[PDB]
From a paper:
A microfluidic screening platform is used to recover and identify various hydrolases from metagenomic sources by screening for the hydrolysis of two substrates: sulfate monoesters, containing one of the most unreactive functional groups in biology, and phosphate triesters. The high sensitivity of our platform enabled us to isolate enzymes with strong and weak activities, including promiscuous side activities that have not been selected in the course of evolution and could not be predicted by sequence homology. Applying the screening workflow to PTEs (using triester 2d as substrate) led to the isolation of eight unique and novel sequences, mostly originating from unknown microorganisms. (iii) One hit, P91, is a member of the α/β-hydrolase (α/β) superfamily related to dienelactone hydrolases (DLHs).
Members of this superfamily possess a catalytic triad41, whereas most bacterial PTEs described to date use catalytic divalent ions to activate a water nucleophile. The X-ray structure of the protein was determined at a resolution of 1.7 Å and structural alignment with a previously characterized DLH43 (also identified in the SSNs) confirmed an α/β hydrolase fold, and highlighted a homologous catalytic triad in the active site of P91 (C118, D167 and H199). Site-directed knockdown mutagenesis of C118, D167 and H199 led to enzyme inactivation, consistent with catalysis by the cysteine-based catalytic triad in P91, which was expected to provide nucleophilic and charge relay catalysis. We observed electron density consistent with two orientations of C118. Figure 5b highlights potential ‘protecting' residues (E37 and H141) that may play a role in stabilizing an inactive conformation of the nucleophile cysteine, as previously invoked. The lack of electron density in the vicinity of the active site supported the absence of a metal-binding site, underlining a role for the triad instead of a metal cofactor in catalysis. Functional tests further ruled out P91 as a metallo-enzyme: treatment of P91 with chelating agents did not affect its activity towards triester 2a, whereas a reduction (or complete abolition) of activity was observed in all other PTE hits tested. However, P91 is the first metal-free bacterial (or archaeal) triesterase to be described, unrelated to insect carboxylesterases. The comparison of the Michaelis–Menten parameters (kcat/KM and KM) of our triesterase hits with those of (i) OP hydrolases isolated from pesticide-contaminated soils and (ii) enzymes with known promiscuous triesterase activity suggests that paraoxon 2a (or parathion 2b with lower or similar catalytic rates measured) and, by extension, the synthetic triester 2d are not the physiological substrates of our hits. This conclusion was also supported by the experimental verification of higher activities in P83, P84, P90 and P91 towards lactone 8c, thioester 7 and ester 6, respectively.
Numbering used by the authors:
A (entry chain B), B (entry chain A): -1 to 237
Write the structure that this text describes.
């Protein structure tokens, strides 16, 4: 019947992280692995549920702890450490790589077949990680607040890229989306961008409206369609 | 085993059209109907194959004859017909509606569950037809050279809209895509736009390169992914 989950301790320098690894015990042997990067709030029920859903699709999934000590922040207390990441992208990248290493350390994971998904800040985190040249098959971002690349990033992405974007999301500027697409074009990345009408930021979270942060709202249609697009990409590229 | 096809005679004023209707004889009773609008060349093997593939998915599909007398043009001989449509959008719309009426006339079609897909000019045709307020559940455009709306079109689309766009297609301007998306936003249409990286115009046709028209090339990845997105939307909205 049910999927199983277990805590995974890992480190990034002096920071101790506690992720949660989801897999189907009913399935035997190595299988594709997915890192799930949460929203800025941190490792929360939303991210863990997405990892569970991935285990139910036949994957081994690690819900990542970016902040360390499984810390969760509310809207008020958040800028430390989110600005920490934007102001030091090398540090941000190492923290993401630590999660990918923790995934690949699990014996249920086929290390040759790994991907990453992420939500909001976690979506941005997927793209940062891909830009290091990590050996990812695919990344999928969900309402990710993507950044333009750093000098030296050109040509490094090895993964397929699917960006699922809320078409009315006020937190992501048109100019940024165009710049990122132009990077993908330049490098001939295997890329897609799916614009989801009537969707804003955090469209995948039924609690999106609970934070009192403007520009965040749930849209079940966008959640379903983006998840299906992700599922299709993984089925195409794995197995 | 195999799907079946039959010719369907219909008229738009003085113009006699000969479409081709595809269905599974193994399936009994009314089923969702799809009009397939071809590229500018006219009713050809490419369009008929897509109608066949739709019949294999459980739909009743009419490959439309826009030009009349099942006429096909090559790249050289094409403009007199095509400029005819762009210079008289009301006429273009009536010609499209005649195909939709011919579909709905077939006893295998559930008239309450109809959609339209189109390729290139046929994609543009789907959007023109939806702008009349036709009772379509969904339209899906594949490398469609979409036009901005006519004065008086606002609020009229009742269908879901999925636009599958080749991200490097030189025949469709960024400004046009942005304008169309802004119409969808304004009216709160149930819309998506899927940008397919590395794809140009006519990405769904393995013969795209055979016409000697610059900007046209096949991309099997884009063909597959756009077809899957279409199939998903139909499964979501029908049944
Ligand atoms: Cl669903
Ligand atoms: Mg490459
Ligand atoms: Mg509406």
């Amino acid at each position: 019947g049910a999927m199983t989950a277990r805590k995974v301790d890992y480190t990034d320098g002096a920071t101790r992280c506690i992720g949660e690894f989801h897999w189907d015990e009913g399935k035997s042997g190595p299988r594709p692995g997915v890192v799930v990067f949460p929203e800025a709030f941190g490792l929360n029920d939303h991210a863990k549920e997405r990892a569970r859903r991935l285990a139910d699709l036949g994957f081994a999934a690690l819900a990542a702890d970016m902040h360390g000590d499984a810390q969760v922040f509310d809207a008020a207390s958040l800028s430390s450490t989110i600005q920490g990441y934007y102001g030091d992208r090398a540090h941000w990248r190492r923290r993401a790589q630590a999660a990918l290493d923790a995934l690949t350390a699990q014996p249920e994971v086929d290390g040759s077949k790994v991907a990453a998904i992420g939500f909001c800040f976690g979506g941005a985190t997927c793209l940062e990680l891909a830009r290091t040249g990590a050996p990812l098959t695919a990344i999928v971002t969900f309402h990710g607040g993507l950044l333009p690349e750093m000098a030296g990033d050109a040509g490094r992405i090895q993964s397929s890229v699917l960006v699922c974007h809320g078409a009315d999301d006020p937190l992501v500027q048109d100019e940024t989306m165009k710049a990122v697409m132009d990077e993908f074009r330049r490098d001939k990345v295997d890329w897609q961008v799916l614009y989801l009408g009537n969707a804003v930021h955090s469209f995948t979270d039924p609690l999106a409206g609970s934070h009192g942060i403007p520009g965040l709202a749930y849209d079940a249609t966008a959640e379903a369609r983006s998840w299906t697009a992700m599922c299709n990409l993984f089925s195409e590229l794995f197995g």
